[PDB]
Every structure is written in structure tokens, then in C-alpha cells.
Amino acid sequence: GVVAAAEKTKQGGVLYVGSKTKEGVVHGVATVAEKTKEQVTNVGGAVVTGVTAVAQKTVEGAGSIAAA
Amino acid sequence: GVVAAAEKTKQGGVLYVGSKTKEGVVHGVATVAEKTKEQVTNVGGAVVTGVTAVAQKTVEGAGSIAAA
Amino acid sequence: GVVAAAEKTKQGGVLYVGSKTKEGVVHGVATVAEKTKEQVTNVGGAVVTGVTAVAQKTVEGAGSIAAA
Amino acid sequence: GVVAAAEKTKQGGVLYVGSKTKEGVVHGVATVAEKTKEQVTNVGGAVVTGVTAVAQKTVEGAGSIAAA
Amino acid sequence: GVVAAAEKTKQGGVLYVGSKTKEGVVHGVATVAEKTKEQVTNVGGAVVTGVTAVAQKTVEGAGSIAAA
Amino acid sequence: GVVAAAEKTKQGGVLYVGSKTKEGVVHGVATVAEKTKEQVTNVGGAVVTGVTAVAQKTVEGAGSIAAA
């Protein structure tokens, strides 16, 4: 077996982004493996997919992951 | 199998995003495996999929995953 | 056998997003595996799928997952 | 056998989104497997599908999943 | 045998979305498997399917159920 | 077996980005491995995918990861 965990606590801005380009297909995070036993896809913190996508002050939480 | 847990506690702005492009198909996070036995797809925190998608101040909880 | 759990506790805005593109089919998070014993699809935190979809201040709760 | 549980406790806004595209079929989270024994499809937290769908402040609850 | 349970306790807003596209069929979360013995579909937290359907402040409850 | 965890505590802006060039497909982070058994994909902190995508003051939380 395995264990993992996280928590957040607390005890105590402009940005200009315009998209312009003629094409984009986007894959955020991705993998392949043929003839494979233990294909495990894991994602944490913040990740987002968009042909434009923005991360102001984005992760104030916390986290961790494990596998196999 | 596997065991895990998480929590939040608490004890104590502009953004400009304009889409413009002629096409985009999008896949957020994805994987494939043929002739394959133990396919496990895991996602946590915040992840979102859109041709535009935005992550302002987004993850303020906490998290973890583990598998297989 | 298997166990998992989560909770939230507590003890103590602008964004401009305009979509514009001529096409997009979108699949949020997805997988395939032919000839497969243990196909397990798990999703937690926040995930949503839309040709535009947005994550303002989104995950203030908390969570975890495990499998197989 | 198998076990899972979750709870919430508590002890203590703008967004502009306009859809515009000429087409989109969308499938939110999906999987397929031919000749396959134990297909288990699980979804938690928040997930929704719509050609636009938005996740303002969305998950304040908590949750978890396991299978097999 | 098998176990799962949950409930909620407590002890202590704008969004603009207009749909516009010429077509989209949508199926929210779905899976298929031919020649399959233990075909199980499970859904928790918040889920709905609609050509637009929206997840403002959506899961204030908590949950799980778990399988096989 | 395996163990890992993280937390955050606390006890105590202009930028100009206009996208313009004629095309870009972008993949955030990705890998492939044929005939390979233990495919593990893990991501944390903040990373985001967009042909323009921006990281003002982005990770003030913390985390770490391990596998296999």
C-alpha cells in the first residue's frame, strides 16, 4: 500500500493578454504507451488547457502525488 | 489498492483574456494504450478544458492522489 | 480492500473572457484501451468541459482519489 | 470489500463569458474498451458538460472515490 | 460486501453565459464496452448534461460511492 | 510502499503581452514510450498550456512528488 496527503492553512494586479494567431490545436499534458501494463495519468497543483490560458497568483494551495 | 486524504483550513484584481484564432480542437489531459491492462486516469486540484480557459487565483484548497 | 476520504473546514473579482474561433470539438479528459481488464476512469477537484470554460477562485474544498 | 466516505463542515464576483464558434460537439469525460471485463466509470467533485460551461467558486464541498 | 456513505453539516455572485454555435450534440459522461461482464456506471458530486449548463457555487454537499 | 506530502502557511504590477505571429500548435509537457511497462505522468506546482499563457506571481504555495 501507499499514502499521500496535503493541506492549506493561513494564520496572519493588472495583466494584458490578447490572443492573435491563425491556428492552434493544443493538448495540455499527454502521453501514450503501447503494450503497457501500468499506464497512470496524474495531475495536481493547477494546470489548465486553452489556446490562451492565464495563471495570475494561481496556486496558493499545496499538494503532492505518488504512483506504483 | 491505495489510501489517501486531504483538507483545507483557515485561521487568520484585473485580467484581460480575448480569444482570436481561426480554429482549434483541444484536449485537456489525455492518454491511450492498446493491448494494455490497468488503465487508470486520475485528475485533481483544478484542471479545466476550453479553447479559452483561465486560472485566476484558482486553487486555494489542497489535494493529493496515488494509484496502483 | 480499500479506503479513501476528504473534508473541508473553515475557522477564521474581475475577468474578461470572450470566445472567438471558427471551430472546436473538445474532449475534456479521455482515454481508450482495447482488450483491457481494469479500465478505471476517475476525476476529482474541479474539471469541466466547454469550448470556453473558466476557473475563477474555483477549488476551495479539498479531495483525493485512489484506485486498483 | 471496499470503503469510501466524505463530509463538509464550517465553523467561522464578476466573470464575462461569451460563447462564439460555428460548431462544436463536446464529450466531457469519456472512455471505451472493446473485449474488456471490468469497465468502471466514476465521477466526483464537480463535472458538467456543455458547449460552454463555467466553474465560478464551484467546489466548496469535499469528496473521494475508489474502485476494484 | 461493500460500504460507502456521506452527508453535509454546517455550524457557523454574477456570471454572464450566452450560448452561440450552429450545432452541437453533447453526451456529458459516457462509456461503452462490448463482451463485458461487470459494466458499472457511477456518478456523484454534481453532474448534468445540457447544450449549455453551468456550475456556479455548485457543490456545497459532499459525497462518495465506490464499486467492484 | 511509498509516502509523500506538502502544506502552505502564512504567519506575517503591470505587464504588456500581445500575441502576434502567424501559427503555433503548442503542447505543454508531453512524452511517449513504446513497449514500455510503467508509464507514469506527474505534474505539480503551476504549469499551463496556451500559445500565449502568462505567469504573474503565480506559485506561492509549495509541493513535491515521487514515483515507482
CA-nearest of C67, A53, E50, A25 to B30 is A25
Exposure string of F35-55, with b = 16+ CB inside 10 Å and e = fewer, is eeebbbbbbbbbbbbbbbbbe
Q: Which residues of E touch D14 (CB under 8 A)?
A: 14
Instruction: Count the neighbouring beta carbons within 10 Å of the beta carbon of residue F25.
Output: 12
Name the nearest CA neighbour of C58 among B26, B53, E65, B5.
B53
| CA atoms D68, E7, B66, C42: torsion sign | positive
Check CB contact under 8 Å for A60 and B61: no
Which subunits sit against E, judged by 3+ Cβ pairs under 8 A?
C, D
**Smallest Cα–Cα separation from C33: which of E39, B28, E32, F10?**
E32
AA letter at A41: T
Helix or strand run (H / E) with residue E57: none
Report in angstroms the alpha-carbon separations of E23 from A25, C24, C29, C49, C50. Answer: 20, 11, 22, 16, 14
Residue with cell 488547457: A49
Across the interface, whether the CB atoms of D5 and E59 are under 8 A apart is answered no
CA end-to-end distance (rounded Å), chain F: 9
State the Cα–Cα distance between residues C19 and A51, nearest whole angstrom: 11
Type of residue numbered F62: A
Number of H helices, E strands in chain E: 0, 4
**Which of residues 42 through 61 in chain D touch B, CB cutoff 8 A?**
52, 55, 59
HSE-CB of C68 using CA atoms within 13 angstroms: 24
* B29 CB-side CA count, 13 A: 28
C48 CB-contact burial (10 Å; exposed 0-12 / middle 13-18 / buried 19+) = buried
Going A27 to A31 to A35 to A40, the CA torsion angle's sign is negative
For chain B, the first-to-last Cα distance in angstroms comes to 6
Q: How many CB atoms lie under 10 A from the CB of residue B51?
A: 33
* Closest residue to B55, CB basis, from F8, F48, F51: F48
Nearest to D56, CA basis, from D20, D22, D15, D5:
D15
Nearest to D15 by CA among E53, B51, E14: E14
Q: Distance between alpha carbon E18 and the CA centroid of its chain, in Å?
A: 22
Q: Among C5, A40, C41, D68, which Cα is nearest to B67's? A: A40
Is residue E50 within 8 A of residue D50, CB to CB? The reply is: yes
3-class secondary-structure state, position A59: strand
Burial zone of D35 (CB within 10 Å; 0-12 exposed, 13-18 middle, 19+ buried): exposed
Element (DSSP H or E) covering residue E8: strand E5-8
- Taking contacts as CB-CB distances below 8 angstroms, the residues of chain F near A59 are 45-46, 58-61
Query: In terms of Cα–Cα distance, which of D68, E11, E30 is closest to C40?
Result: D68
Complete DSSP assignment for C3-59: --EEEE-------EEE---SB--EEEEEEE-SS-S--EE---SB--B-SB---TT-B
β-pairing, D5-8 vs E5-8, is: parallel
Only one residue has cell 490497468, namely: B38
Q: Which three cell numbers, joined as nine digits, stand for F52?
A: 500565449
Q: Across the C/E interface, how many CB contacts are shorter than 8 Å?
A: 13
Asked if C touches F (at least 3 Cβ pairs < 8 angstroms), the answer reads no
Resolution (A): 3.5
